Amino acid sequence: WEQYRDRVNMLQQERIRDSPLLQAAKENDLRLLKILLLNQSCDFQQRGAVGETALHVAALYDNLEAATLLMEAAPELAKEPALCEPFVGQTALHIAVMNQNLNLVRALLARGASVSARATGAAFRRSPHNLIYYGEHPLSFAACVGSEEIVRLLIEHGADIRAQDSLGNTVLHILILQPNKTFACQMYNLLLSYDEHQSLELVPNHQGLTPFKLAGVEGNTVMFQHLMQKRKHVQWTCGPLTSTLYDLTEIDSWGEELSFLELVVSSKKREARQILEQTPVKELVSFKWKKYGRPYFCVLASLYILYMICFTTCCIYRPLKLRDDNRTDPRDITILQQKLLQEAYVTHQDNIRLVGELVTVTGAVIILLLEIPDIFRVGASRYFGQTILGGPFHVIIITYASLVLLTMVMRLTNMNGEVVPLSFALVLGWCSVMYFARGFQMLGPFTIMIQKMIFGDLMRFCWLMAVVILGFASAFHITFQTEDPNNLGEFSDYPTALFSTFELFLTIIDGPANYSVDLPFMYCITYAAFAIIATLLMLNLFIAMMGDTHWRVAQERDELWRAQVVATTVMLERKMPRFLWPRSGICGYEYGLGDRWFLRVENHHD
Amino acid sequence: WEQYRDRVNMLQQERIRDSPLLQAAKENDLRLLKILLLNQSCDFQQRGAVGETALHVAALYDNLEAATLLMEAAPELAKEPALCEPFVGQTALHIAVMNQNLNLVRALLARGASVSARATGAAFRRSPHNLIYYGEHPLSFAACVGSEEIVRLLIEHGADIRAQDSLGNTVLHILILQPNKTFACQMYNLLLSYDEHQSLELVPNHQGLTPFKLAGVEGNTVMFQHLMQKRKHVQWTCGPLTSTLYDLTEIDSWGEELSFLELVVSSKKREARQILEQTPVKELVSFKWKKYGRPYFCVLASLYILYMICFTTCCIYRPLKLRDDNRTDPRDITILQQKLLQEAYVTHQDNIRLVGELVTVTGAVIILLLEIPDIFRVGASRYFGQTILGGPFHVIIITYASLVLLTMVMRLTNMNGEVVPLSFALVLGWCSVMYFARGFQMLGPFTIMIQKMIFGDLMRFCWLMAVVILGFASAFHITFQTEDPNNLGEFSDYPTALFSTFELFLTIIDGPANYSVDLPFMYCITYAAFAIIATLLMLNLFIAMMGDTHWRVAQERDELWRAQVVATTVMLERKMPRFLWPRSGICGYEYGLGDRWFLRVENHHD
């Protein structure tokens, strides 16, 4: 919260100016500081707003001389941390490390500053309010500021490289989370130089992520390449051809419930799908998709299309009889009604439809039993919100299965009105065939474009379209409110006028005309204005903005489709039985590499 | 006027060649000048067309030797200015300063040229006829030509830095108005070096603008950054984090009736909205919008939508009865008429509609008493013409309120025909909901695109559209003028033919066909030509030009939407009560900075 941080800095500067010791520490006025520190009647434990000492203020404003005379006067101030909520564990060593002062860090370490101090304040937690996240320990601070000498000098004073913060992150995790990806790899190597192993690279955080899995999730492609330099083995280089064995242990994750690939492809960060196009991963997912994933996806698409053909055939042949009562309203055109449950199964064709309806019911039950554990396995927002995992398609297939079971309930209890859930089920279940467009380069990018338009600019067109429809529909309705509806019935009542104005917006019905009668002139003026504003202008502006969007997100559509193919492959390997999905890669016992499994990549370089 | 300036130069060169003294001053022929100046029977006060002396002609053509021999011969020519209308106050010192001749300026200043001479001619006023605007005094001329030595030497001779021209502009104002923004900041610093204070930077012009407010209005972003360097205070720099206090005294304008932000966002210059994206301003307006402006705008949008729902409901349930007379015309389809005032309020539902109509009337009265003082506060052209301030939306909401009160007048006086102002009021009042699209990133840019298309290429499409409609409608009308209108009635008379050709232009009605009868062949030829030229070609050309426009002004649409958000925030703070809008920023009495208010910006720089 910006107001809270501003009010904290208000209090901090007020208590710095209010205390002469903190004021002399902030400025370089060492003289008044000297007369203050020759006073032996105080322990120099004066605190600011957040409980910081004068050594913290001297370290903050880079006053090395004021700081060193403070520790000659009071040597215990190096151990003292700040106390209040934004700075629960900040010491002067943290400020000296973050300011990258070698002499100040040496001077604090000479008098006994703790290297294991945890800055557990709210200003150091991984928060989007905070601009940086350097961890809690001075070693992670030194690794993140890029000062290798402070890292070496802290390790020589006993800084734990295995120290974890409140999120469970070690120094490797925090180094991966840095935006300065260039020298973060060099600092990663420098911290790996003191590993000595129960290795630091295999330590997970509180989310269960190792630094390899965290670099996969966060989309750190530079750190991913740097980490897979240490996991590759060049077999031979014959001319331009090079054979390389890549370790698949931390990528394939064969004996793992939650795999590296699933964590990469279901990550909420945009650059995480750039991990899927790196050298060990792209070849692995390409082999998995082109060898097992595409035929199984085609088979599942074929049986789902046959299932929807059966459901459509059962919908067409649904049991209807002639209506019992007689029509008194001339506007009533209903001639048929639903049969009762006893009347609906007295024919051989009715028994065939019963077999098909049982197939439809057990298919909806199969869909629910196959996707409810997938809701319970991951986050429900992450299940239904990810374009890559198939979120809206999961929404509409669960809705289709629920509508099919609701139609079964209404059929068993003789409830009239099955046309409503049957129509929603037909539309949604057939639109769920567009999930299987992911398997093809032609159809998948266009389906992603359709979804991006639905949740994008069609939604923003709908508000202003409803505004124009409401105004012009009310004008059209009150224009024809005094006229005979038998001559022009497009605006006879207000819902009909709203629907007619919606249809005239999209120009899917003709303009209401009757040349044998005299129409109101306000209809002519209002419809001319509606034709200029809605038809000629807002439709084609929406079409042009859709064309601009289609030009602008074409690349992102392509990475989203490749990530959708990877997600489909991961889901298919996870959910299908293991005998249909053999282990990818080759085992490495003949290479002297143990029971590990490897991917062989042969590449040509000039 | 170019003809006037050309005729002045005609006269000027005619009187330069006509007088031997001015001719000898123009050329470097110092010999004939010497025989002229040894004549002691003349005071050498010969004047040209605009009353200039020979010293002016010598300074114009960079004749230093002729000028100094003129000043030895006639020393009083340095005091003499030109006299006529384009050069009312121009002296030879002005020409010497503008030509950047150090020796000539020194020679004029040695013999008593006035440093306080005001060039009040028409060639020096701030005019779009004039290419440059350097002010009226030689100090502003020296500041604007970029010669720092002439500035220093004029101040050493007593040039007033607080001198104002006819527009009230000081040298700081004129330095801001220069297009050469690079060294204008250096000259601004050089003139601020002699300020000694009642400061020069706090002096307003005749428009009330200080140089800070003028740099805001004119969009001088370089001068704005340069002026906000002197109004910022860096608190601390801890690692990559920097905390800076920015002064909000000349930006927020809390106790001022016309604020800096309002003057920036309602400026008629295009680059002024680039002021709103600078470091102290963008954070301030973002905090103001995201903390108070967006919820108040959402609440006002919700109550306006509820008000239009009430107005639409009162329009739907408007009092109508069966018509008294009988229909003799078979083309007449009117079955209902308006009730009288005594007949319209004899029902409980009629009383509910009366309550809703009173709500509608008091809402229109609230709209008028809320926006008429806003017309009187600013320029009416600037109120109704600015896209950023909401000009056309103000036009249509004032028109809607006027139509509602007109409908009240017709209802009270039993005037038939309320459907016309009710229909215009319904369309315009519902289209006024699109004003509240400014609060959202989805809707606001698209509404700006709609307005830019309405006042842009739809207008230019309408003329050629009316041309094609007139020609083809007249051809269609005279084609079917001899035919039976009961078989094809689209072109029975000329307004119907015009409306039908308008609808066939946009393809919102079908082509007139009747296969049971024989149509004229000229209808087929003319409609084929109309379908090729108007439908296939001009519509899609207008759509393609709209798509090109949508591609080309997308960026400008984005700055216009951000400026609209700033304008909405400024209007909401100005018009709502002060207890709903607390003062932005933090007070600075604990920083040793007085009663000023500051914005704290914490930024990260690597």
Side-chain angles (χ1 to χ4, degrees):
Chain A
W1 201 38
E2 304 179 314
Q3 295 297 109
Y4 175 70
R5 296 298 301 267
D6 282 11
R7 194 66 199 61
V8 163
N9 190 179
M10 284 202 105
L11 298 170
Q12 274 187 275
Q13 298 284 344
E14 181 201 3
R15 274 69 174 174
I16 280 178
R17 297 188 320 116
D18 210 295
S19 186
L21 184 61
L22 314 176
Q23 181 64 47
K26 165 180 169 69
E27 300 288 327
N28 219 6
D29 309 345
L30 56 92
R31 321 150 56 180
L32 277 296
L33 187 69
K34 274 155 139 67
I35 295 89
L36 280 171
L37 295 178
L38 276 296
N39 173 44
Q40 279 99 9
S41 188
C42 197
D43 46 358
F44 318 106
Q45 288 284 327
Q46 304 183 3
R47 304 209 165 275
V50 288
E52 85 272 38
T53 77
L55 190 57
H56 295 68
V57 190
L60 175 56
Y61 296 102
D62 274 329
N63 305 332
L64 171 58
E65 299 175 355
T68 186
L69 281 71
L70 273 153
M71 325 189 267
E72 306 172 2
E76 80 267 0
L77 285 181
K79 191 263 183 182
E80 307 297 318
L83 308 168
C84 285
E85 191 43 60
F87 305 98
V88 177
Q90 188 189 40
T91 71
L93 183 56
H94 284 107
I95 315 172
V97 175
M98 183 152 60
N99 271 327
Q100 296 179 74
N101 290 318
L102 294 173
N103 295 327
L104 192 55
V105 167
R106 270 194 269 264
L108 272 295
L109 281 181
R111 319 225 65 171
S114 170
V115 298
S116 298
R118 310 186 38 165
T120 49
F124 316 100
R125 300 302 186 99
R126 199 186 173 200
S127 179
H129 319 123
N130 289 307
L131 287 145
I132 61 172
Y133 169 58
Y134 285 3
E136 297 177 354
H137 304 82
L139 183 63
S140 55
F141 272 55
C144 288
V145 296
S147 62
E148 69 275 16
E149 280 89 26
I150 308 189
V151 176
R152 292 177 194 272
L153 160 77
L154 280 160
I155 297 169
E156 293 179 353
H157 278 71
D160 201 2
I161 70 148
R162 306 192 38 113
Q164 287 184 301
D165 51 15
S166 56
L167 280 184
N169 290 320
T170 72
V171 65
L172 300 190
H173 293 94
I174 306 158
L175 272 173
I176 287 165
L177 297 164
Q178 295 311 302
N180 51 73
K181 298 180 186 291
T182 73
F183 60 95
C185 283
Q186 293 179 356
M187 200 75 48
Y188 203 97
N189 280 343
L190 196 144
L191 273 296
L192 277 179
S193 279
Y194 305 83
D195 195 7
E196 201 263 331
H197 292 310
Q198 53 185 350
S199 178
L200 189 59
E201 209 155 26
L202 297 164
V203 177
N205 57 23
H206 290 162
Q207 309 186 336
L209 298 192
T210 70
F212 196 89
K213 303 158 99 68
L214 186 74
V217 164
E218 296 284 316
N220 206 338
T221 44
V222 179
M223 203 75 63
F224 188 77
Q225 295 183 43
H226 162 256
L227 258 63
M228 287 295 306
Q229 293 316 104
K230 280 73 176 175
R231 287 150 181 83
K232 80 169 71 178
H233 159 83
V234 174
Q235 287 186 281
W236 44 261
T237 308
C238 202
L241 315 167
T242 299
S243 179
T244 319
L245 273 194
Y246 283 91
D247 205 17
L248 289 183
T249 304
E250 292 172 293
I251 299 178
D252 194 36
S253 297
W254 194 65
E256 292 218 332
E257 294 293 328
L258 183 63
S259 49
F260 172 79
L261 287 163
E262 192 186 344
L263 280 155
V264 169
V265 67
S266 57
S267 182
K268 290 184 184 298
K269 292 182 73 69
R270 183 178 182 270
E271 293 83 3
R273 65 174 178 260
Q274 286 152 228
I275 295 292
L276 302 173
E277 309 286 279
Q278 305 299 300
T279 308
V281 175
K282 173 171 213 262
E283 275 84 327
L284 169 82
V285 298
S286 295
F287 165 76
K288 275 167 167 169
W289 177 247
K290 293 187 286 185
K291 178 82 174 178
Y292 309 100
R294 185 179 296 113
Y296 300 155
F297 205 52
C298 284
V299 163
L300 282 167
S302 306
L303 281 71
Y304 186 73
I305 285 164
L306 288 178
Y307 171 77
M308 290 301 306
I309 284 164
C310 174
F311 172 59
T312 311
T313 307
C314 291
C315 280
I316 287 156
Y317 287 87
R318 65 187 184 109
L320 304 168
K321 56 172 175 181
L322 294 166
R323 72 174 304 168
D324 293 337
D325 45 357
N326 290 318
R327 292 188 296 272
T328 60
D329 201 16
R331 294 187 64 96
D332 189 18
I333 61 168
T334 289
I335 53 169
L336 264 58
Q337 53 170 345
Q338 303 172 186
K339 281 173 181 169
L340 289 196
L341 189 57
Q342 54 263 54
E343 320 190 44
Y345 296 108
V346 292
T347 313
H348 182 63
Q349 180 69 39
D350 283 359
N351 284 7
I352 286 159
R353 186 191 29 94
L354 178 58
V355 170
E357 281 165 334
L358 285 164
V359 165
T360 295
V361 160
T362 193
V365 164
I366 275 171
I367 283 163
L368 287 183
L369 293 175
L370 190 66
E371 307 209 353
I372 301 299
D374 283 26
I375 308 174
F376 291 151
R377 199 178 156 274
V378 287
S381 159
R382 185 179 67 189
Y383 194 56
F384 294 134
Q386 287 294 107
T387 300
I388 285 172
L389 303 175
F393 285 112
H394 286 131
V395 171
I396 68 176
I397 194 53
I398 289 166
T399 302
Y400 162 75
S402 298
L403 284 157
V404 162
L405 296 191
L406 163 70
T407 309
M408 182 179 72
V409 164
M410 302 177 57
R411 176 77 58 95
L412 287 166
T413 61
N414 274 329
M415 192 173 153
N416 209 286
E418 298 169 38
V419 59
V420 180
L422 271 191
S423 288
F424 285 107
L426 277 163
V427 167
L428 286 174
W430 272 113
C431 281
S432 299
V433 180
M434 272 192 272
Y435 172 79
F436 295 101
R438 284 163 170 79
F440 315 100
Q441 201 178 12
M442 294 177 71
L443 305 174
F446 193 72
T447 315
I448 287 184
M449 272 291 182
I450 287 165
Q451 169 175 169
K452 277 189 151 300
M453 291 304 179
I454 285 177
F455 308 145
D457 52 358
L458 183 63
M459 201 80 246
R460 88 186 68 186
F461 190 50
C462 276
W463 308 90
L464 313 184
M465 183 177 176
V467 170
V468 173
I469 277 159
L470 271 167
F472 277 101
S474 53
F476 284 148
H477 176 251
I478 70 151
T479 298
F480 283 98
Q481 202 170 5
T482 60
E483 319 293 313
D484 195 22
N486 306 327
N487 301 103
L488 192 148
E490 281 83 359
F491 316 111
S492 55
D493 45 341
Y494 194 64
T496 307
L498 282 164
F499 190 53
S500 310
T501 313
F502 165 80
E503 291 169 295
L504 286 163
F505 202 101
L506 296 179
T507 57
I508 63 188
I509 69 165
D510 272 339
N514 198 343
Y515 304 109
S516 56
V517 308
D518 287 318
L519 299 186
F521 78 97
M522 289 289 311
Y523 161 68
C524 287
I525 314 186
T526 302
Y527 190 52
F530 179 74
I532 290 155
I533 296 300
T535 288
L536 178 56
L537 192 72
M538 293 177 70
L539 281 179
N540 305 323
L541 202 44
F542 172 67
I543 289 157
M545 182 197 43
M546 266 202 297
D548 291 331
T549 307
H550 193 277
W551 181 265
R552 285 187 168 104
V553 298
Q555 184 178 2
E556 196 210 347
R557 146 191 73 92
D558 285 308
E559 292 85 4
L560 281 171
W561 177 68
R562 283 175 279 112
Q564 272 187 350
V565 170
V566 177
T568 303
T569 308
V570 166
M571 181 264 318
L572 276 184
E573 178 143 43
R574 177 175 50 85
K575 294 177 73 68
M576 293 177 71
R578 190 43 79 183
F579 82 104
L580 290 163
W581 281 86
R583 191 171 183 179
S584 282
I586 59 173
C587 53
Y589 64 93
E590 61 266 355
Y591 303 105
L593 289 164
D595 79 326
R596 300 292 179 90
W597 277 56
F598 294 89
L599 187 87
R600 200 193 70 104
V601 181
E602 187 163 341
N603 53 300
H604 154 80
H605 198 128
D606 287 333
Chain B
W1 200 39
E2 304 178 314
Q3 295 297 109
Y4 175 70
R5 296 298 300 267
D6 282 11
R7 194 66 199 61
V8 163
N9 190 179
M10 284 202 105
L11 298 170
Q12 274 187 275
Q13 298 284 344
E14 181 201 3
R15 274 69 174 174
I16 280 178
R17 297 188 320 116
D18 186 74
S19 186
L21 184 61
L22 314 176
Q23 181 64 47
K26 165 180 169 69
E27 300 288 327
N28 218 6
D29 309 345
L30 56 92
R31 321 150 56 180
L32 277 296
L33 187 69
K34 275 155 139 67
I35 296 89
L36 280 171
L37 295 178
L38 276 296
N39 173 45
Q40 279 99 10
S41 188
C42 197
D43 46 358
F44 318 106
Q45 288 284 327
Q46 304 183 3
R47 304 209 165 275
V50 288
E52 85 272 38
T53 77
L55 190 57
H56 295 68
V57 190
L60 175 56
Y61 296 102
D62 274 329
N63 305 332
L64 171 59
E65 299 175 354
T68 186
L69 294 174
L70 274 153
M71 293 182 286
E72 309 172 358
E76 80 267 1
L77 285 181
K79 191 263 183 182
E80 307 297 318
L83 308 168
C84 285
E85 192 43 60
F87 305 97
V88 177
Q90 188 189 40
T91 71
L93 183 56
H94 284 107
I95 315 172
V97 175
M98 183 152 60
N99 271 328
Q100 296 179 74
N101 290 318
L102 294 173
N103 295 327
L104 192 55
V105 167
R106 270 194 269 264
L108 272 295
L109 281 181
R111 319 225 65 171
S114 170
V115 298
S116 298
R118 310 186 38 165
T120 50
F124 316 100
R125 300 302 186 99
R126 199 186 173 201
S127 179
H129 319 123
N130 289 307
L131 287 145
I132 61 172
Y133 169 58
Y134 285 3
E136 297 177 353
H137 304 82
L139 183 63
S140 55
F141 272 55
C144 288
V145 296
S147 62
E148 69 275 16
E149 280 86 23
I150 308 189
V151 176
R152 293 177 194 272
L153 160 77
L154 280 161
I155 297 169
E156 293 179 353
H157 278 71
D160 201 2
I161 70 148
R162 306 192 38 113
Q164 287 184 301
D165 51 15
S166 56
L167 280 184
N169 290 320
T170 72
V171 65
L172 300 190
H173 293 94
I174 306 158
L175 273 173
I176 287 165
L177 297 164
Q178 294 311 302
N180 51 72
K181 298 180 186 291
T182 73
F183 60 95
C185 283
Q186 293 179 356
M187 200 75 45
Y188 203 97
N189 280 343
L190 196 144
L191 273 296
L192 276 179
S193 279
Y194 306 83
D195 195 7
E196 201 263 331
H197 292 310
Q198 53 185 350
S199 178
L200 189 59
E201 208 155 26
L202 297 164
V203 176
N205 52 26
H206 291 162
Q207 309 186 336
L209 298 192
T210 70
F212 196 88
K213 302 158 99 67
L214 186 75
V217 164
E218 296 284 316
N220 206 338
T221 44
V222 179
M223 203 75 63
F224 188 77
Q225 295 183 43
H226 162 256
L227 259 63
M228 279 307 297
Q229 293 316 104
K230 280 73 176 175
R231 288 150 181 83
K232 80 169 71 178
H233 159 83
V234 174
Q235 287 186 281
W236 44 261
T237 308
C238 202
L241 315 167
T242 298
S243 179
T244 300
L245 273 194
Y246 284 92
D247 205 17
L248 289 183
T249 303
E250 292 172 293
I251 299 179
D252 194 36
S253 297
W254 195 66
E256 183 178 1
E257 67 273 15
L258 183 63
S259 49
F260 172 79
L261 287 164
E262 192 186 344
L263 280 155
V264 169
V265 67
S266 57
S267 182
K268 290 184 184 298
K269 292 182 72 69
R270 183 178 182 270
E271 293 83 3
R273 65 174 178 260
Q274 286 152 228
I275 294 292
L276 302 173
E277 309 286 279
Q278 305 300 300
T279 308
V281 175
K282 174 171 213 262
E283 274 84 327
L284 169 82
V285 298
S286 295
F287 165 76
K288 275 167 167 169
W289 177 247
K290 293 187 286 185
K291 178 82 174 178
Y292 309 100
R294 185 179 296 113
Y296 299 157
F297 205 52
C298 284
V299 163
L300 282 167
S302 306
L303 281 71
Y304 186 73
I305 285 164
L306 288 178
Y307 171 77
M308 290 301 306
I309 284 164
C310 174
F311 172 59
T312 311
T313 307
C314 291
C315 280
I316 287 156
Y317 287 87
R318 65 187 184 109
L320 304 168
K321 56 172 175 181
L322 294 166
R323 72 174 304 168
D324 293 337
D325 45 357
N326 290 318
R327 292 188 296 272
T328 60
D329 201 16
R331 294 187 64 96
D332 189 18
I333 61 168
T334 289
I335 53 169
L336 264 58
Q337 53 170 345
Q338 303 172 186
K339 281 173 181 169
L340 289 196
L341 189 57
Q342 54 264 54
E343 320 190 43
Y345 296 108
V346 292
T347 312
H348 182 63
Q349 180 66 42
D350 283 359
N351 284 7
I352 286 159
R353 186 191 29 94
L354 178 58
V355 170
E357 281 165 334
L358 285 164
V359 165
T360 296
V361 173
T362 193
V365 164
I366 276 171
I367 283 163
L368 286 183
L369 278 71
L370 191 65
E371 309 206 352
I372 299 298
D374 283 26
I375 307 174
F376 291 151
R377 199 178 156 274
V378 287
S381 159
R382 185 179 67 189
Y383 194 56
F384 293 134
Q386 287 294 107
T387 300
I388 285 172
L389 303 175
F393 285 112
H394 287 131
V395 171
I396 68 176
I397 194 54
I398 289 166
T399 302
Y400 162 75
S402 298
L403 284 157
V404 162
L405 296 191
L406 163 70
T407 309
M408 182 179 72
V409 164
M410 302 177 57
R411 176 77 58 95
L412 287 166
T413 61
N414 274 329
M415 192 173 153
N416 209 288
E418 298 169 38
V419 59
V420 180
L422 271 191
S423 288
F424 285 107
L426 277 163
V427 167
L428 286 174
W430 272 113
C431 281
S432 299
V433 180
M434 272 192 271
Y435 172 79
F436 295 101
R438 284 163 170 79
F440 315 100
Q441 201 178 12
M442 294 177 71
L443 305 174
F446 193 72
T447 315
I448 288 184
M449 272 291 182
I450 287 165
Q451 169 175 169
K452 277 189 151 300
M453 291 301 183
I454 285 177
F455 308 146
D457 52 358
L458 183 63
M459 201 80 246
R460 88 186 68 186
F461 190 50
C462 276
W463 308 89
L464 313 184
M465 183 177 176
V467 170
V468 173
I469 277 160
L470 272 167
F472 277 101
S474 53
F476 285 148
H477 176 251
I478 70 151
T479 298
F480 283 98
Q481 202 170 5
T482 61
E483 318 296 313
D484 195 22
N486 307 327
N487 301 103
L488 192 148
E490 281 83 359
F491 316 111
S492 55
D493 45 340
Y494 194 65
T496 307
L498 282 164
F499 190 53
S500 310
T501 313
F502 166 79
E503 292 169 295
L504 286 163
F505 182 77
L506 295 178
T507 54
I508 63 188
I509 69 165
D510 272 339
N514 198 343
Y515 304 109
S516 56
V517 307
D518 287 319
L519 299 187
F521 78 97
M522 290 286 312
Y523 161 67
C524 287
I525 297 170
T526 300
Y527 190 52
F530 179 74
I532 290 155
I533 296 306
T535 292
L536 178 56
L537 192 72
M538 272 166 90
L539 281 179
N540 305 323
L541 202 44
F542 172 67
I543 289 156
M545 183 195 40
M546 269 202 297
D548 291 331
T549 307
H550 193 277
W551 181 265
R552 285 187 168 104
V553 298
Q555 184 178 2
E556 196 210 347
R557 146 191 73 92
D558 285 308
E559 292 85 4
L560 281 171
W561 177 68
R562 283 175 279 112
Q564 272 187 350
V565 170
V566 177
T568 303
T569 308
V570 166
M571 181 264 318
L572 276 184
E573 178 143 43
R574 177 175 49 85
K575 294 177 72 68
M576 293 177 71
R578 190 43 79 183
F579 83 104
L580 290 163
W581 281 87
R583 191 170 183 179
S584 282
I586 59 173
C587 53
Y589 64 92
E590 61 266 355
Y591 303 105
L593 289 164
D595 79 324
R596 293 181 184 271
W597 278 56
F598 294 88
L599 187 87
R600 200 193 70 104
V601 181
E602 187 163 341
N603 53 300
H604 154 80
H605 198 128
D606 287 333

